[PDB]
Amino acid sequence: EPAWQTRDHLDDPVIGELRNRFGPDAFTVQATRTGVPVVWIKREQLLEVGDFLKKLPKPYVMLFDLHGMDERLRTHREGLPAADFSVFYHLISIDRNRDIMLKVALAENDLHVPTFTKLFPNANWYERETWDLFGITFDGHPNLRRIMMPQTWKGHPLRKDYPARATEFSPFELTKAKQDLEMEALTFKPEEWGMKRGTNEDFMFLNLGHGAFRIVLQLDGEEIVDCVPDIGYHHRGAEKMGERQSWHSYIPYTDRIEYLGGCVNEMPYVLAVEKLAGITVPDRVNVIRVMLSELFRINSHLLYISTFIQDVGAAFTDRQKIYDLVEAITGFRMHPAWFRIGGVAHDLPRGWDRLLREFLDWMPKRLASYEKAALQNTILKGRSQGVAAYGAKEALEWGTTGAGLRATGIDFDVRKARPYSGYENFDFEIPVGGGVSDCYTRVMLKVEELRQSLRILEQCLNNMPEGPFKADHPLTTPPPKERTLQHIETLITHFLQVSWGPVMPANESFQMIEATKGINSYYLTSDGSTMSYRTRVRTPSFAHLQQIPAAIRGSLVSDLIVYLGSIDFVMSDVDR
Amino acid sequence: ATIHVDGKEYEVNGADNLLEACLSLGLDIPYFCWHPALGSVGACRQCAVKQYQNAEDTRGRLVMSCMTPASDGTFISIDDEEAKQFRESVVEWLMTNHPHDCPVCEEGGNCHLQDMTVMTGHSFRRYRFTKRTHRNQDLGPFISHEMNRCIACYRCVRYYKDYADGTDLGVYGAHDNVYFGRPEDGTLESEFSGNLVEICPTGVFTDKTHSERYNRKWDMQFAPSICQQCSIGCNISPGERYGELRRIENRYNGTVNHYFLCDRGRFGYGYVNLKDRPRQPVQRRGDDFITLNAEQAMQGAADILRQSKKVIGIGSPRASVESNFALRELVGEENFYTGIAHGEQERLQLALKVLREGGIYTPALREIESYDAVLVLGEDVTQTGARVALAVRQAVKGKAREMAAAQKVADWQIAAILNIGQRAKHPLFVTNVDDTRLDDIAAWTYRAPVEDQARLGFAIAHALDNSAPAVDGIEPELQSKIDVIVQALAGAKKPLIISGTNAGSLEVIQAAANVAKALKGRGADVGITMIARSVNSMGLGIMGGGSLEEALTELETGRADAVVVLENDLHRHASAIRVNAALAKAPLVMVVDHQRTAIMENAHLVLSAASFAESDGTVINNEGRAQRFFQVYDPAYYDSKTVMLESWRWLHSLHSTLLSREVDWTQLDHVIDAVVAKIPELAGIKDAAPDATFRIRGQKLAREPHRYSGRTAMRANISVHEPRQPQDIDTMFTFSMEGNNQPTAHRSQVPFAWAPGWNSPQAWNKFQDEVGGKLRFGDPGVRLFETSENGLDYFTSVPARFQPQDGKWRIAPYYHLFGSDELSQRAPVFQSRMPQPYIKLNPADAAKLGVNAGTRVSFSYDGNTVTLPVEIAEGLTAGQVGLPMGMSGIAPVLAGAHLEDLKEA
Amino acid sequence: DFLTEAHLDLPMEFESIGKAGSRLGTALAMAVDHEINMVSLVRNLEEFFARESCGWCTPCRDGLPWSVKILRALERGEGQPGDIETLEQLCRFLGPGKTFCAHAPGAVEPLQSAIKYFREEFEAGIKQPFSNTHLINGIQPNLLK
Amino acid sequence: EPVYLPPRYRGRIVLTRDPDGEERCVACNLCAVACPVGCISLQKAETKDGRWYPEFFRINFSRCIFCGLCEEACPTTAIQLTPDFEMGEYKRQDLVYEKEDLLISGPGKYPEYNFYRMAGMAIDGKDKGEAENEAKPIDVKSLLP
Numbered sequence A: 001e002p003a004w005q006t007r008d009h010l011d012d013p014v015i016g017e018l019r020n021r022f023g024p025d026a027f028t029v030q031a032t033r034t035g036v037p038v039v040w041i042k043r044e045q046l047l048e049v050g051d052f053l054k055k056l057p058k059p060y061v062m063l064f065d066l067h068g069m070d071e072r073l074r075t076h077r078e079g080l081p082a083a084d085f086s087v088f089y090h091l092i093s094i095d096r097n098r099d100i101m102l103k104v105a106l107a108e109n110d111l112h113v114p115t116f117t118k119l120f121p122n123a124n125w126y127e128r129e130t131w132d133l134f135g136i137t138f139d140g141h142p143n144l145r146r147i148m149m150p151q152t153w154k155g156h157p158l159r160k161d162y163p164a165r166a167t168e169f170s171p172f173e174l175t176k177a178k179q180d181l182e183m184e185a186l187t188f189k190p191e192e193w194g195m196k197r198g199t200n201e202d203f204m205f206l207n208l209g210h211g212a213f214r215i216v217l218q219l220d221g222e223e224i225v226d227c228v229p230d231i232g233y234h235h236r237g238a239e240k241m242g243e244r245q246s247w248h249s250y251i252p253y254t255d256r257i258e259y260l261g262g263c264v265n266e267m268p269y270v271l272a273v274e275k276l277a278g279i280t281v282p283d284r285v286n287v288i289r290v291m292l293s294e295l296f297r298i299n300s301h302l303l304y305i306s307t308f309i310q311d312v313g314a315a316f317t318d319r320q321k322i323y324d325l326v327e328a329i330t331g332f333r334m335h336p337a338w339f340r341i342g343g344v345a346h347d348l349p350r351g352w353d354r355l356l357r358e359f360l361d362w363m364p365k366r367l368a369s370y371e372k373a374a375l376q377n378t379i380l381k382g383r384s385q386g387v388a389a390y391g392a393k394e395a396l397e398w399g400t401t402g403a404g405l406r407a408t409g410i411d412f413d414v415r416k417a418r419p420y421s422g423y424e425n426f427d428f429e430i431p432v433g434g435g436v437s438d439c440y441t442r443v444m445l446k447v448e449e450l451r452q453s454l455r456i457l458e459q460c461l462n463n464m465p466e467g468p469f470k471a472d473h474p475l476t477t478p479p480p481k482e483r484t485l486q487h488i489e490t491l492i493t494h495f496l497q498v499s500w501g502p503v504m505p506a507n508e509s510f511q512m513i514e515a516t517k518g519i520n521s522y523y524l525t526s527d528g529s530t531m532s533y534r535t536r537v538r539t540p541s542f543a544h545l546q547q548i549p550a551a552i553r554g555s556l557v558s559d560l561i562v563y564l565g566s567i568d569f570v571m572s573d574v575d576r
Numbered sequence B: 001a002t003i004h005v006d007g008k009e010y011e012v013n014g015a016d017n018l019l020e021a022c023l024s025l026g027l028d029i030p031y032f033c034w035h036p037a038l039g040s041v042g043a044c045r046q047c048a049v050k051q052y053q054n055a056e057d058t059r060g061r062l063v064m065s066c067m068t069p070a071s072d073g074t075f076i077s078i079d080d081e082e083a084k085q086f087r088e089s090v091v092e093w094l095m096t097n098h099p100h101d102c103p104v105c106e107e108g109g110n111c112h113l114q115d116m117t118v119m120t121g122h123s124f125r126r127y128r129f130t131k132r133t134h135r136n137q138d139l140g141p142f143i144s145h146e147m148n149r150c151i152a153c154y155r156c157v158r159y160y161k162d163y164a165d166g167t168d169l170g171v172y173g174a175h176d177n178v179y180f181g182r183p184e185d186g187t188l189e190s191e192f193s194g195n196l197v198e199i200c201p202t203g204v205f206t207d208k209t210h211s212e213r214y215n216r217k218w219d220m221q222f223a224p225s226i227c228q229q230c231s232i233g234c235n236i237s238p239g240e241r242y243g244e245l246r247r248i249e250n251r252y253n254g255t256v257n258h259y260f261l262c263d264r265g266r267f268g269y270g271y272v273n274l275k276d277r278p279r280q281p282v283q284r285r286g287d288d289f290i291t292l293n294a295e296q297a298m299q300g301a302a303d304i305l306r307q308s309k310k311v312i313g314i315g316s317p318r319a320s321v322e323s324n325f326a327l328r329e330l331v332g333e334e335n336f337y338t339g340i341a342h343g344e345q346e347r348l349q350l351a352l353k354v355l356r357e358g359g360i361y362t363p364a365l366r367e368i369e370s371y372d373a374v375l376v377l378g379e380d381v382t383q384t385g386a387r388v389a390l391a392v393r394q395a396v397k398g399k400a401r402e403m404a405a406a407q408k409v410a411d412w413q414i415a416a417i418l419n420i421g422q423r424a425k426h427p428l429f430v431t432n433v434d435d436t437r438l439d440d441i442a443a444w445t446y447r448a449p450v451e452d453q454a455r456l457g458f459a460i461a462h463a464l465d466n467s468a469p470a471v472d473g474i475e476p477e478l479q480s481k482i483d484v485i486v487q488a489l490a491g492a493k494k495p496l497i498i499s500g501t502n503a504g505s506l507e508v509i510q511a512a513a514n515v516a517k518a519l520k521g522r523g524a525d526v527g528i529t530m531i532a533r534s535v536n537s538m539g540l541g542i543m544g545g546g547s548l549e550e551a552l553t554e555l556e557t558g559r560a561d562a563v564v565v566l567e568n569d570l571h572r573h574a575s576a577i578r579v580n581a582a583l584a585k586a587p588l589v590m591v592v593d594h595q596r597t598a599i600m601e602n603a604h605l606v607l608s609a610a611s612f613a614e615s616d617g618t619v620i621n622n623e624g625r626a627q628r629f630f631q632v633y634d635p636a637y638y639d640s641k642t643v644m645l646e647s648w649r650w651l652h653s654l655h656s657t658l659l660s661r662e663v664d665w666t667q668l669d670h671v672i673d674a675v676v677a678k679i680p681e682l683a684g685i686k687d688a689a690p691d692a693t694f695r696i697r698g699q700k701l702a703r704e705p706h707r708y709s710g711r712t713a714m715r716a717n718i719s720v721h722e723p724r725q726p727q728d729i730d731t732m733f734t735f736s737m738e739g740n741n742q743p744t745a746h747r748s749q750v751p752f753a754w755a756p757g758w759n760s761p762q763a764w765n766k767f768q769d770e771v772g773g774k775l776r777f778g779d780p781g782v783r784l785f786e787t788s789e790n791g792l793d794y795f796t797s798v799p800a801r802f803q804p805q806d807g808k809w810r811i812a813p814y815y816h817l818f819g820s821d822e823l824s825q826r827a828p829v830f831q832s833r834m835p836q837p838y839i840k841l842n843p844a845d846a847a848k849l850g851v852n853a854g855t856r857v858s859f860s861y862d863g864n865t866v867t868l869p870v871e872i873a874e875g876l877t878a879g880q881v882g883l884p885m886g887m888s889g890i891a892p893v894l895a896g897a898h899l900e901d902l903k904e905a
Numbered sequence C: 001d002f003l004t005e006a007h008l009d010l011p012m013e014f015e016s017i018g019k020a021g022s023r024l025g026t027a028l029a030m031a032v033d034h035e036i037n038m039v040s041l042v043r044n045l046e047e048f049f050a051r052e053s054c055g056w057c058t059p060c061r062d063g064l065p066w067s068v069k070i071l072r073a074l075e076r077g078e079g080q081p082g083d084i085e086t087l088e089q090l091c092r093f094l095g096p097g098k099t100f101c102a103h104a105p106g107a108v109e110p111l112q113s114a115i116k117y118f119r120e121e122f123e124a125g126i127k128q129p130f131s132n133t134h135l136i137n138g139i140q141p142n143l144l145k
Numbered sequence D: 001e002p003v004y005l006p007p008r009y010r011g012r013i014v015l016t017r018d019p020d021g022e023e024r025c026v027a028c029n030l031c032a033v034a035c036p037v038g039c040i041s042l043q044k045a046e047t048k049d050g051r052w053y054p055e056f057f058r059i060n061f062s063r064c065i066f067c068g069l070c071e072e073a074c075p076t077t078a079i080q081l082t083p084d085f086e087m088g089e090y091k092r093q094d095l096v097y098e099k100e101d102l103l104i105s106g107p108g109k110y111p112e113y114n115f116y117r118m119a120g121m122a123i124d125g126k127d128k129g130e131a132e133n134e135a136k137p138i139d140v141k142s143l144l145p
């Protein structure tokens, strides 16, 4: 019974609880390769089901994801309710270490769902993105406006009838948008942003400028009364591109989401595609992927910590050494594009042991230097403690994952809770904080994660398995190159995989991983074709950016700047 | 019948085999030797499934799904482990000898062997020994041969020999050195040899014409179009790349031309890529040829047309219905002339009157295969309507099919059927001026002049029905053969009468109508087929107009001082001296054409019209079926200065500029609405294809596959800035990948067949309701007219017998599949395949002239002395001289004409 | 199929020889002495059967020559691991019903019985490590386990 | 100092030559379709002896993301990403590299692979039966059974 098998999860106790509560005919269980019980709920029972799951003895406390899907061109929907569109809700029980996906089927003429914001406040931005990209209205939403596209945008780009490729450039629309930027402040209505009490004659409205983004600030003097972060300035159409590229040729796009991560961003996508293909990778592939993911985690953590130290007023050679090793292994520093379906693009180069040994023997003195510069610095400690602090309740209700969630004391790491890529064969600790997640605790947790990633790299170096760097599956893409260049059937397989694409049988797969800034997940729907029917990417920085108004309510602008530096986020991760 | 595949219950046809039943249900079973059109033979052993004796059976047995009836209560498994292992083993055995050739193989990305290799999941070679090799043969200009890539699936020989009745392809040798080819190098002689490139699942037989300018199937931009090279109207998928027409694939149509084209349609597209085509409007002022853009071409043309007293228009059977109608609206109904001669127009409207007023059902091309007796009167079907000849061969094999059905042999078990029906066949009687290519299967062939062919038809009609007019002067031996024909036709449940306009004789069409009416009066299920000359001969006949002689008279008398010639060279329908003199007399000649013709020297204005690859339109079949063709590519995407518009667009904007002094580049649906409003007989062309607002769940239909490559590079040498995607306002297709080509989409127009896991022409299985049947949501195209309630009367104009008169030589028409049709004989690959210009003579007449075979004789027709070398024709009759119609200098209006001063040069 | 000395007491009937894992056939038995190597005898048999294929159907036409080449390698001592398993798979997949006629099951009956009884000669043929790939200079091979 | 680059570095793209000196590319178009950006455009041409080669080969380097998917997709190792990164330009049109800007005079990173030594299709210097692991063509009229 492999890990990629299609299961309906009828033995999950949440299915029996839902059956005993709402009756056996109130929902439809779908068998998937997501590893999660997927149930189809009536629209009229969605809030009741969400409230019931919120009040279980080990409750489902986190809205992990919420998005839509255009089901109109989907030809393999056997055992599925009739739908033109659908909305899915991914909910996580942390005490249970379980999750459930709820699906609401919608007809094309009635695209409205009850708002989920009364149960989970992060549903606000998730529903704004679903409205923006699919045109699905959420009744009761306070400010249901566009969040990726500008407000003067026609059409919903993630619909199947929307043309993906770039339209013709018009200078006149550019001058019109520049004009709209000219007196945006003069024609600023604080009703189009969800704000209130616009000019008491003491409230000031400003715009501001990890990526560049705007946030409108309502200030009473220097105190923040409300704020609305304006995002979507870095929207690259990555999911729509997932429908326009083959399963193989989408991998560089996985790189450029969360561009400080690289192979870390490759990992959930190729793991989900291997679930769709039914591929179990060999152990050497697992250790190679873990080693590259931990090298890039170290690189991203070092950049984040070095940026935080400089911003407060309390770094390049280490990242250069990591980039040199990654450049030797993959041929590229920043966007390696090196993981593959079934394995990795090449074997490890001869001499990788020497470079990794030189990196690991040179790092612990730098680790002591960073711990002295951060944990033992009083100016950093007095600047960073207590500013924008939240507890477990606020991290659970806002979908906060990564260092902030563990700083609240919730011991939730994906590598330990739901292991992937052979992470269960490594000995490493998960650092957690007290009950308070402020800037100092988050940065301290990132430093401890740096130490643990160095331990994982030491274990990767010490016993690196000998074996194949690609799986023996027929759907390993591409095949091994020497057999491609020598053998006719391997040439045939390579020819068809790199041109039309590999045929993934119709299914749905899911994979969440512990990325450098939180939990990154790929949710892939295959319609039996050589491209993805739906590529949904859940990124931590979207959810972390949504939590900003609920954490610096009543703080100062300098506190907001420190909070922005303390959040490990990048804007490409937010907007994707 | 009820079958259970992998425990899932399905309802199928019990008369089918399990392979076709399971492919029709959407299941995937790999296969090589089976084809929907050829039947099942059980050769390749690829299609193995596991059959169980009942539901409570676990052992099972590997059976061949193509050789197993899908009977009631069947239990099979496709996903059985032993069946999957065996299918992977069969792919492995084919892979042991297969050459390492995929990059340099024209079948790559379009190869069925690649697809079934991947589908079985075989990607690991454990064979370490040598591969057998083979020398290749030269199969002529169209088909390239690579015997290394063969898998010995026997599809080629079964198609070419048991289906198309070709004689020069076969299997040779033995155990694992089995060779598939000709007995020696030379051109493949079948008129339908080009279907090998889609029948062969590998790259053995490949399109040599495509191989010259090769590109892969993902790089092709396809559109659904209609073949323009004769009247049969076979659906095609032209595909282009880099602004040139690359390939013609067969487009499946279960009502017309299901899997097969003829070689003329498949390989005669090369005129589209000629470098002398007009690409811009060009105005002749003195000796200068000023290039214009579209707007000032319309302005100058409208000024000269406004200042002229009478403007006449000359259409063409090449042009679509929309172009001819737009010319008819520009010049008026009373000033519009069809571009064909008076005799051709008389024969065409007589065939139209027979088809839509004779009360006899005219069959589609696919339905021809189900008739029980065939009488072909005057039509060289293999050289003029070739796909009808292939359907006639299927109708002939119908007798063996019935004989095997009488012994309870299943209809897919083709080898048993052919063994039971050894040489028995349904009756075929062909009649021509000489021997035809249908004579191998014909029960009788009549070689005679067209008067005697008509008299034989009239005599058959009189012998079937005594109310038909009698023929006086029939010899006793010819009378005995007439009674043979009459006993065969009267004894058939479904007799079919084929004739056409190519014989050059009105009386032949009248005799065919008499035979069909006589059979209808006896209660038979008789059908009648009329083969026209060109792609839109029937549409031009339905629209109607004056003859070309009347237009030439209007030009010569000076009553018309402006002539707009649409897609017509005018030399195939009238004498070149008269045409040139009449056009030189006119002070304004405007030629709207996509080919460089001879009359463009006299033309004051030349409009660069679009051919079928660059235009949309509607053409009418020889059976009255209205079919839409769609534009394949935008000609201005690569060359920005090319002004190559549709002919209806040119003429509509010219009419707008003539009336209101403003141009109007209209839309196609507006022109079609104008046609159906103004000509009620052409009202059915609205339903041929849906309008440009048609969507599949909101999106358009994609012209190119989803993996189409080179988007930011194919034009980068011209400019690095990617141009705007060319907009299509005329049709529901988009000029990009951003559209729909799903097999389950509710549409009838499929630009190309592709499904995941099926990259070959076998992907047409996914687009059909059942394999080899119709398209899932109906075949495209609509019949314009229904069968009349009442028929015609008998034609009492029985001609006299042919009398050879001294000094005069009756011209007997000889049609060639390569050479007679104008546009295809302009194609450069046809020149090697084209016969040399040979004038045919009886041995008696050649001995009378003192002329041997090969010596050149000169004759004067219409004051033009031309010289050709002599071929001796045994089957011709004395007093007749045989000429190749449609060749260079021999216009097809010479059929039935007489010749003077035939003497040795 | 080949039979051993213990089967020599069987009455020459269809049912008795069929029950022993062979068939009566033409009932014209051929005796094999100890000086005859079974790999050479089966190589000769399969050479006949492969060159007497009619070429119609894939398994006989294309898998009997594979058995011939494996047997030639084993006869020359150039056998490689997986050869006996390939022969057994060829025997299983050329049985009754898999091929168009009965030529190929009759072909694989002696190979079946010779591997069943005299397997030691066939394993004595295997002397080389398995290889069908040569090294390509700039490409590290996928070292399968 | 010059910047050190590892041999795997994904920089400027070149087209290489086989060890006999002929250009490796057979214009099979696998690199163009495997390009996610779609910045490769080429056309197949053929010599008198039947050898496939690119008539033109152009790469839009203003579009190329140097991902190496084409080199991975190349079945002849013709297209290769090389350790060079100094490709800055004054005009964006000059970033379209034709075949005269890509075809270097050597084998690049894969020094010995010749695809035409593997292909069954015959060219000059290699008739039928001269590829690797290929038997000579037995004529169908041969006297041997």
Ligand code: SF4
Pocket: A492, B098, B099, B100, B101, B102, B105, B106, B107, B108, B109, B111, B112, B113, B114, B149, B201, B202, B203, B204
């Ligand atoms: S016929 Fe098919 S499998 Fe054989 S070389 Fe050509 S593309 Fe490859």
Ligand code: SF4
Pocket: B149, B150, B151, B152, B153, B154, B155, B156, B157, B180, B199, B200, B201, B202, B204, B205
């Ligand atoms: S040449 Fe083609 S069609 Fe003929 S047997 Fe070989 S693979 Fe089949």
Ligand code: SF4
Pocket: B227, B228, B229, B230, B231, B232, B233, B234, B257, B261, B262, B263, B264, B265, B266, B385, B386, B387, B388
């Ligand atoms: S029969 Fe006529 S319409 Fe059909 S492919 Fe041939 S030329 Fe074209």
Ligand code: SF4
Pocket: C052, C053, C054, C055, C056, C057, C058, C060, C061, C099, C100, C101, C102, C103, C104
């Ligand atoms: S098993 Fe029979 S039908 Fe098949 S190739 Fe061999 S001899 Fe011919």
Ligand code: SF4
Pocket: D013, D031, D034, D035, D036, D037, D038, D039, D040, D059, D063, D064, D065, D066, D067, D068, D069, D070, D071
């Ligand atoms: S490196 Fe990538 S982007 Fe550049 S040409 Fe090759 S496939 Fe295209």
Ligand code: SF4
Pocket: B103, D024, D025, D026, D027, D028, D029, D030, D031, D032, D042, D070, D073, D074, D075, D076, D077, D078, D079
């Ligand atoms: S993949 Fe290689 S051989 Fe094929 S067209 Fe591209 S560079 Fe040429």
Ligand code: FES
Pocket: B019, B030, B031, B032, B033, B034, B041, B042, B043, B044, B045, B046, B047, B064, B065, B066, B067
């Ligand atoms: S398809 Fe049935 S044996 Fe070939």
Ligand SMILES: [Ca+2]
Pocket: B614, B615, B616, B631, B646, B730
């Ligand atoms: Ca158009």
